[PDB]
Coordinates of N, CA and C in Angstrom, one line a residue:
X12 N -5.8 -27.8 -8.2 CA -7.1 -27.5 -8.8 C -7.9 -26.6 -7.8
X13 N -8.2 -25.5 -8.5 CA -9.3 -24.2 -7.6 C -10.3 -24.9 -7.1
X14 N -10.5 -25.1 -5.9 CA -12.1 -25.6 -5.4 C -13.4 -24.3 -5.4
X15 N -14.2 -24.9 -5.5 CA -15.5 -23.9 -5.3 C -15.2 -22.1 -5.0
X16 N -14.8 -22.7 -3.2 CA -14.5 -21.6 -2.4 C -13.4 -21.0 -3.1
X17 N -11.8 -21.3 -3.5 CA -10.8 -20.5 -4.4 C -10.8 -20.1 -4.7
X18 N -12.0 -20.0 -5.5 CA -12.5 -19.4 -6.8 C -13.1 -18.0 -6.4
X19 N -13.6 -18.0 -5.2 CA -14.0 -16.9 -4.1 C -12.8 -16.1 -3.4
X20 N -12.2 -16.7 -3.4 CA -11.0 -15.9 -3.0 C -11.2 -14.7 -3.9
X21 N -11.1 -14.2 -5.3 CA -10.4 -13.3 -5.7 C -11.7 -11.9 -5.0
X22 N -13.0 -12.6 -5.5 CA -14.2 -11.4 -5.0 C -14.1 -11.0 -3.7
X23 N -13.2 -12.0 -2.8 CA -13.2 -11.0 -1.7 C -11.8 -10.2 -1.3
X24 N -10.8 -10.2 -2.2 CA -9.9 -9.4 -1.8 C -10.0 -7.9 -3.0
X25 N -9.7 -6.9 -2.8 CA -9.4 -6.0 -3.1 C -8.3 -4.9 -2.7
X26 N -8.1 -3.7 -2.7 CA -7.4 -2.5 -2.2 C -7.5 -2.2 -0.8
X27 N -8.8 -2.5 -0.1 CA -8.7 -2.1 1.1 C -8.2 -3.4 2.1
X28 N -8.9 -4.9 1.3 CA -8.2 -6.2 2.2 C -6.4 -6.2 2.0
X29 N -6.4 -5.5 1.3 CA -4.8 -5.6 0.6 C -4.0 -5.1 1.4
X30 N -4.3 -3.6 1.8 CA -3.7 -2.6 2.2 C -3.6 -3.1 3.8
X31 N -4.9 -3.5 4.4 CA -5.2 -3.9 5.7 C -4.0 -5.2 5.9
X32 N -4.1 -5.7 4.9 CA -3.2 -6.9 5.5 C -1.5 -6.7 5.1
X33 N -1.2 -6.2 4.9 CA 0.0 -4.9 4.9 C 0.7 -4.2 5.8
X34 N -0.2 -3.7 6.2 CA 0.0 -2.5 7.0 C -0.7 -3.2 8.6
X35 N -1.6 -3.9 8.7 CA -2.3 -3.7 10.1 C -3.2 -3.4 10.2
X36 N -3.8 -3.1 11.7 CA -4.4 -2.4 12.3 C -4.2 -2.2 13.8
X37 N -4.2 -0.7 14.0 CA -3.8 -0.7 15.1 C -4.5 0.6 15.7
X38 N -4.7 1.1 17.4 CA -5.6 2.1 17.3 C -5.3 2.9 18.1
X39 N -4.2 2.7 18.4 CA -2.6 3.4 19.1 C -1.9 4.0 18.3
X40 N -1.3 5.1 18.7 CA -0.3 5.3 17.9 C 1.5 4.8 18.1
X41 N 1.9 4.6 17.0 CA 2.7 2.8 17.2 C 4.0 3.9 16.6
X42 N 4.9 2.9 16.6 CA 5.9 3.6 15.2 C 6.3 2.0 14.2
X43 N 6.5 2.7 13.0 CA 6.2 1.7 11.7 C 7.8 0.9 11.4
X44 N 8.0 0.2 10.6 CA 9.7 -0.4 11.1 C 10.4 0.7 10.6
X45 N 10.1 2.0 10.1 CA 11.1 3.1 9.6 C 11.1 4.3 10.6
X46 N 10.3 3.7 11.6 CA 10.6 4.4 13.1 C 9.5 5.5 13.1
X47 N 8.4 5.7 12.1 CA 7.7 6.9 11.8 C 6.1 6.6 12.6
X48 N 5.8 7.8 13.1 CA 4.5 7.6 13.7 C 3.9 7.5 12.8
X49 N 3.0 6.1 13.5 CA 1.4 5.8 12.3 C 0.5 5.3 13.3
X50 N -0.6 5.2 12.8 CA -2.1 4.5 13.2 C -2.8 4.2 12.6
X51 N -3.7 3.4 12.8 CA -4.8 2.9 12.3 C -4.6 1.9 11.2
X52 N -4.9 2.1 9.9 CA -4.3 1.0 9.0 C -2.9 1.7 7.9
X53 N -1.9 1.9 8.4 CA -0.5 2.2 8.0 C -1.0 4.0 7.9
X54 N -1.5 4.4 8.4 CA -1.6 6.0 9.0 C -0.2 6.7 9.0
X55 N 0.2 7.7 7.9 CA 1.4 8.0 8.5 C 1.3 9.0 9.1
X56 N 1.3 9.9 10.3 CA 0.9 10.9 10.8 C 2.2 11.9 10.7
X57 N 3.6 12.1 11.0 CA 4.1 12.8 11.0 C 5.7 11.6 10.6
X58 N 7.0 12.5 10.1 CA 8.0 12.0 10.1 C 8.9 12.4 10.9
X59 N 8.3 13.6 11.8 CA 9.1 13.8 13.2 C 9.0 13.0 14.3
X60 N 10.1 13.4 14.7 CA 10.5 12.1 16.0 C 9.7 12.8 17.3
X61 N 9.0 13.6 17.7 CA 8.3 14.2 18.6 C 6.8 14.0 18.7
X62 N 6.6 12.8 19.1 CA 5.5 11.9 19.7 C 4.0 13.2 19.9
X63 N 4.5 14.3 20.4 CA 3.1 15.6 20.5 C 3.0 16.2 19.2
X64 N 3.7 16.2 18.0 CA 3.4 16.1 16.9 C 2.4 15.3 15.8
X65 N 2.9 14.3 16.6 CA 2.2 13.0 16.1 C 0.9 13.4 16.6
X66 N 0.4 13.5 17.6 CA -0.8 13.4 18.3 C -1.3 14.4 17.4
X67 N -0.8 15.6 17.6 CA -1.5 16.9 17.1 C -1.9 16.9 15.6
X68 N -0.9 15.6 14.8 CA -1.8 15.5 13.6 C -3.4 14.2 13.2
X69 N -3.0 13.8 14.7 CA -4.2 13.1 14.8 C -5.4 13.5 14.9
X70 N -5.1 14.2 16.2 CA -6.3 15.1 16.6 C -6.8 16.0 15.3
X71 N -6.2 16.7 14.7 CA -6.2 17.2 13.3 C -7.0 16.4 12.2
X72 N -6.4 15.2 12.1 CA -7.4 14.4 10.9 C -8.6 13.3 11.2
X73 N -8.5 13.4 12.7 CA -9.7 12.6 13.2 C -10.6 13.5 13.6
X74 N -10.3 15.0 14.0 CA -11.1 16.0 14.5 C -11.7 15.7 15.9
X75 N -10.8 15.5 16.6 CA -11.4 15.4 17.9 C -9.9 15.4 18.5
X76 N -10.4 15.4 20.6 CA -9.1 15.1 21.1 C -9.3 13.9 21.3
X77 N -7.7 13.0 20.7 CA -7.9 11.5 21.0 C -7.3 10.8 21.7
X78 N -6.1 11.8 21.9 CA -4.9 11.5 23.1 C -4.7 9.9 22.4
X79 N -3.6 10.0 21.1 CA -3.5 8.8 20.2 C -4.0 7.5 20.4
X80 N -5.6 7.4 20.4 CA -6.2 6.6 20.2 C -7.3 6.9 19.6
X81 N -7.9 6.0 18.7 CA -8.8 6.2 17.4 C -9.7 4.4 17.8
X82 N -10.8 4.7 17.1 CA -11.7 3.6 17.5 C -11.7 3.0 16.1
X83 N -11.9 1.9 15.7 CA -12.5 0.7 14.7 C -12.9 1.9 13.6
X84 N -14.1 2.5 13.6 CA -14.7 3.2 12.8 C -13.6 4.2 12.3
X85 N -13.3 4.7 13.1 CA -12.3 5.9 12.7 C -11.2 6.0 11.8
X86 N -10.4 4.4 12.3 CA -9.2 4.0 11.5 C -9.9 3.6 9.9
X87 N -10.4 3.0 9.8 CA -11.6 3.0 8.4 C -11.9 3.6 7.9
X88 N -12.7 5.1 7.9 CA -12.4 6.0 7.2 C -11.4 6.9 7.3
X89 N -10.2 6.7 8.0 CA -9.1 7.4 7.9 C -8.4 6.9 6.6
X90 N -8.9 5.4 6.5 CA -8.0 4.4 5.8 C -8.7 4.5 4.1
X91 N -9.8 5.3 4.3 CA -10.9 5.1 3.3 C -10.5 6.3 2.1
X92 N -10.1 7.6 3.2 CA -9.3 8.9 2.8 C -7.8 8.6 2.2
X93 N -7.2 7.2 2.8 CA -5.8 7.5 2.2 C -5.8 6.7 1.3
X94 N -6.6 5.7 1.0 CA -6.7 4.8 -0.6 C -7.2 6.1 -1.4
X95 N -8.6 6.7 -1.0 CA -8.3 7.7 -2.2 C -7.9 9.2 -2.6
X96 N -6.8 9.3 -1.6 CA -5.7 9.7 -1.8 C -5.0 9.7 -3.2
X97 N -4.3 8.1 -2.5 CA -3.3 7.6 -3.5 C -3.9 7.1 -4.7
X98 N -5.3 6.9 -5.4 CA -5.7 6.5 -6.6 C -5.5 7.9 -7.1
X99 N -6.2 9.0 -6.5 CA -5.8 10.6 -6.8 C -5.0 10.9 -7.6
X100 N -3.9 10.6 -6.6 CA -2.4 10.9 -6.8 C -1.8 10.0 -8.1
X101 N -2.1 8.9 -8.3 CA -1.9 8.2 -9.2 C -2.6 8.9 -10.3
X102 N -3.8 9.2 -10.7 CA -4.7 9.3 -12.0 C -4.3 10.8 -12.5
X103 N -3.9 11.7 -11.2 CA -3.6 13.3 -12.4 C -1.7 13.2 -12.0
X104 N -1.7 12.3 -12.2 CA 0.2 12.1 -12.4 C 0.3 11.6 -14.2
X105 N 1.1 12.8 -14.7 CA 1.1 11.9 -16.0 C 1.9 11.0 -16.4
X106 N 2.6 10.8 -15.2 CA 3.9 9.3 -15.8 C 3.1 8.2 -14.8
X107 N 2.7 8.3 -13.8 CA 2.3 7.2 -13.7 C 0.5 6.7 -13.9
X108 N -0.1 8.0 -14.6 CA -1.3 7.0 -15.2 C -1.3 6.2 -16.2
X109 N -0.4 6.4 -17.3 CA -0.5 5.9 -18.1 C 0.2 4.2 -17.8
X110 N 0.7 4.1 -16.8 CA 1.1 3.1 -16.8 C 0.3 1.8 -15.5
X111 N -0.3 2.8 -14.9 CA -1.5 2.3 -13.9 C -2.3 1.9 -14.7
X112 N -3.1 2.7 -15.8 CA -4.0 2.4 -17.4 C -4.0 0.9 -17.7
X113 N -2.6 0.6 -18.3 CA -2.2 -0.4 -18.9 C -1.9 -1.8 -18.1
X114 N -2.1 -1.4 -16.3 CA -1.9 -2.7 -15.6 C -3.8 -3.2 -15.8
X115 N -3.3 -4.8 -15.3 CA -5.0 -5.5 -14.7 C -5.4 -4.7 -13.5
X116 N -6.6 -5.3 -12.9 CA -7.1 -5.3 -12.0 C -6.5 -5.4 -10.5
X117 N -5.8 -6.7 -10.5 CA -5.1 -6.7 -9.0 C -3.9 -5.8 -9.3
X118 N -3.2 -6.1 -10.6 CA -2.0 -4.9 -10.5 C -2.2 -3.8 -9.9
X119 N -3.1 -3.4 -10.5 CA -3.6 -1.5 -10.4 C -3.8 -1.6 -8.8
X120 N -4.2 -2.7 -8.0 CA -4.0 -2.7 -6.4 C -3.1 -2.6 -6.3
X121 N -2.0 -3.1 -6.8 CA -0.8 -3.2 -6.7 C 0.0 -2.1 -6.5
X122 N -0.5 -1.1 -7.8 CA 0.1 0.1 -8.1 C -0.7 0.6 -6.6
X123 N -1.6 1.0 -6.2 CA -2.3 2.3 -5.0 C -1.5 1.7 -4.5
X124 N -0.9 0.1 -3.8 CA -0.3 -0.1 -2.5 C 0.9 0.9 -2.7
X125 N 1.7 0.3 -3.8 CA 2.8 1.5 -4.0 C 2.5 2.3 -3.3
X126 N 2.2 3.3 -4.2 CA 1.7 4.9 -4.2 C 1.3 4.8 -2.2
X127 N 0.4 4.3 -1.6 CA 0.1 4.7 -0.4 C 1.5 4.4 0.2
X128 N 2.0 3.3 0.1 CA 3.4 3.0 1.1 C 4.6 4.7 0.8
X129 N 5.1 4.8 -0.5 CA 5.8 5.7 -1.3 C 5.7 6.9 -0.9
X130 N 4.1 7.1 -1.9 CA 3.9 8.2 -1.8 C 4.4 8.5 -3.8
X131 N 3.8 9.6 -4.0 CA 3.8 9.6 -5.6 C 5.2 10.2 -6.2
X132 N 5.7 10.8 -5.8 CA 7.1 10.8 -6.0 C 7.8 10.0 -6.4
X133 N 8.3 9.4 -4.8 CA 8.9 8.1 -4.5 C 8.5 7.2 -5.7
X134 N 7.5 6.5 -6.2 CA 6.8 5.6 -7.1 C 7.3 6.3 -8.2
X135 N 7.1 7.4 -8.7 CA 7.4 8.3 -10.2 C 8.8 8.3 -10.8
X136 N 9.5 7.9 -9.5 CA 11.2 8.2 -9.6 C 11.4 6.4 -10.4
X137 N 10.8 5.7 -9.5 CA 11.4 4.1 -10.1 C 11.1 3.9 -12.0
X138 N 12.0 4.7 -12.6 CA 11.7 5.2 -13.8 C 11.5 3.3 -14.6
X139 N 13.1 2.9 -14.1 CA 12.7 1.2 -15.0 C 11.7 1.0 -14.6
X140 N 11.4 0.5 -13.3 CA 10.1 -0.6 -12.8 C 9.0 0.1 -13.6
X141 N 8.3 1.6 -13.6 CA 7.8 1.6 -14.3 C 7.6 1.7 -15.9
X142 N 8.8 1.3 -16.4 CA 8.5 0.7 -18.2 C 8.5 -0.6 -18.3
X143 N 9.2 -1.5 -17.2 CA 8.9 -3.0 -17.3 C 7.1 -3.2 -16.9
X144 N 6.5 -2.5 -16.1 CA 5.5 -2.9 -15.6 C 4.8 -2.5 -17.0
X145 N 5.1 -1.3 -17.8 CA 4.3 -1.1 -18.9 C 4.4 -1.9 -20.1
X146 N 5.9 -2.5 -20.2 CA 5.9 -3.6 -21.3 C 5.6 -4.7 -20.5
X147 N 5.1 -5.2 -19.8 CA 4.5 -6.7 -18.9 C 5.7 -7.5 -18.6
X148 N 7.1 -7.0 -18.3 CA 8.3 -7.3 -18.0 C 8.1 -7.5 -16.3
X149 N 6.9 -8.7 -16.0 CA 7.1 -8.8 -14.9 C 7.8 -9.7 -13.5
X150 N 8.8 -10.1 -14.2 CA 9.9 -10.5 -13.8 C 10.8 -9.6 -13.2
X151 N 11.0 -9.0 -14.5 CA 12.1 -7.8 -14.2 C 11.8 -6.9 -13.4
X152 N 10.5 -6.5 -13.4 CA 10.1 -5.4 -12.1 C 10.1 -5.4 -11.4
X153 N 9.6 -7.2 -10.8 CA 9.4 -7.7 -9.5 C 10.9 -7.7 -8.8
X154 N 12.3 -8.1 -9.9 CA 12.9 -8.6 -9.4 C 14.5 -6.8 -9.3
X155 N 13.8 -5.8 -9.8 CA 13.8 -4.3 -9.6 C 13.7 -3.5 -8.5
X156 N 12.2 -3.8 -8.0 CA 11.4 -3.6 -6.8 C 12.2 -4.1 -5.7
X157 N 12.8 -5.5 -5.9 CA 13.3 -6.0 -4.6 C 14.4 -5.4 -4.4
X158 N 15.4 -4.2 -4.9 CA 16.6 -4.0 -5.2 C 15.9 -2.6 -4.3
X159 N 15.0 -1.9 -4.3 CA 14.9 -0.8 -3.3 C 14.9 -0.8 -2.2
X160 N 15.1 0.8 -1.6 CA 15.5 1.0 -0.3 C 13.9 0.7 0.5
X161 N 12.7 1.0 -0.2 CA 11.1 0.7 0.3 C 11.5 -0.4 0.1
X162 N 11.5 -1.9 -0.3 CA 10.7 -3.1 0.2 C 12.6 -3.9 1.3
X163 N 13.9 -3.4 0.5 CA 14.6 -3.9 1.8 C 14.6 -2.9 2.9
X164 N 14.4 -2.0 3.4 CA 14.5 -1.5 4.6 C 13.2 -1.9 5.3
X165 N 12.1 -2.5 4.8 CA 10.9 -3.0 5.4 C 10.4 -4.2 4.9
X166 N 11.0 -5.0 4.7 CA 10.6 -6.2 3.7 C 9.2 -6.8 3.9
X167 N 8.7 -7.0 5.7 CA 7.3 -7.6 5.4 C 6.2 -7.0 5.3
X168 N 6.4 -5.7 5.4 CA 5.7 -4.8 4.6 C 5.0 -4.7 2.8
X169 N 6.2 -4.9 2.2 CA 6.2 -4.8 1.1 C 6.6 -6.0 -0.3
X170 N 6.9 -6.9 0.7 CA 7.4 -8.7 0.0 C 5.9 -8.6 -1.1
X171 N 4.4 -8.6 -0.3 CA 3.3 -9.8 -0.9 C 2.9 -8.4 -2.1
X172 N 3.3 -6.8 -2.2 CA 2.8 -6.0 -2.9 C 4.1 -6.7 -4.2
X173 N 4.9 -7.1 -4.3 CA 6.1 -7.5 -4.9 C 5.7 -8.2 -5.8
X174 N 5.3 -9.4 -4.7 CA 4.6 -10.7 -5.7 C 3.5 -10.5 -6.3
X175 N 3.0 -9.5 -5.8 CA 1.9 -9.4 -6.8 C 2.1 -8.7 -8.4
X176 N 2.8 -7.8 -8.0 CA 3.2 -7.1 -9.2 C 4.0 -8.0 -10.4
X177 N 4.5 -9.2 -9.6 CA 5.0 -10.4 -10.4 C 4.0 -11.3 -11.3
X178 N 2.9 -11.6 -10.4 CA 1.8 -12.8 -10.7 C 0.9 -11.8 -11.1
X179 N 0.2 -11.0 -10.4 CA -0.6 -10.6 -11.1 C -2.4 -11.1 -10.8
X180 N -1.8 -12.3 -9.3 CA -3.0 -13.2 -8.6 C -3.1 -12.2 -7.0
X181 N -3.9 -12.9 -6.5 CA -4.2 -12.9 -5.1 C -2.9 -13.9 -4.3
X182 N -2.3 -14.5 -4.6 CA -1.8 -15.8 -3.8 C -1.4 -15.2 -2.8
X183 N -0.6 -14.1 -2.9 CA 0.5 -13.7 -1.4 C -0.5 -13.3 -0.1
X184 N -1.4 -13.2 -0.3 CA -2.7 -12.8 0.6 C -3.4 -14.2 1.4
X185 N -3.4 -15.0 0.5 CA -3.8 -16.4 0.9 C -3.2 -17.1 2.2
X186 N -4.0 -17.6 2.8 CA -3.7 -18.3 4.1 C -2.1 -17.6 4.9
X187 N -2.4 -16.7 5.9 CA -1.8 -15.7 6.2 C -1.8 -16.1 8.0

């Protein structure tokens, strides 16, 4: 039985607690388990393997020299730009609005984590997952999703965006 406070749980998670507890935070530049430079909160900065690359697109989207380091503030709106990004990229896509439309609330988190992890392509290709998610076949989706090269080539990355798209709750977020 939900106590008081459980019941608080949902108001305080959203897309950005989602994403953050996903991805990290980090204020280095790191490489992610698919070996790709990132920073800040799952930042993908380049897919070349040449580390001055990396930097030079940092320096680029932070606007300063940072010699791959970014402060608290910076990763935040870095992070603020690539959530809406990917709702962007979701809403003038016409295969996958209509099926972002027809999810809930935490789904539709569900759906941006995609889309930010992916990328809109990647997401627009998973042609079943996206008609199971539209007929509420969330079994099948979930159990779809797990069959890709995104959640097995990085599984704890992408396990709790899974379950969610299964349940349709906060739970996978909970006591972490």
């Amino acid at each position: 039985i939900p106590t008081t406070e459980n019941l608080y749980f949902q108001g305080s998670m959203n897309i950005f607690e989602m994403l953050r507890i996903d991805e990290g935070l980090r204020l280095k530049i790191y490489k992610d388990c698919e070996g790709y430079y990132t920073i800040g909160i799952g930042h993908l900065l380049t897919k070349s393997p040449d580390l001055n690359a990396a930097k030079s697109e940092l320096d680029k989207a932070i606007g300063r020299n940072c010699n791959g380091v970014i402060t608290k503030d910076e990763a935040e709106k870095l992070f603020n730009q690539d959530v809406d990004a990917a709702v962007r990229g979701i809403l003038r896509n016409a295969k996958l609005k209509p099926v972002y439309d027809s999810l809930d609330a935490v789904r539709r988190c569900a759906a941006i984590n995609h889309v930010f992890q992916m990328g809109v392509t990647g997401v627009a290709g998973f042609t079943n997952v996206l008609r199971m998610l539209q007929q509420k076949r969330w079994d099948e989706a979930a159990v779809n999703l797990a069959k890709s090269r995104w959640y097995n080539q990085c599984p704890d990355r992408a396990k709790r965006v899974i379950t969610t798209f299964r349940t349709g709750t906060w739970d996978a977020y909970k006591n972490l």
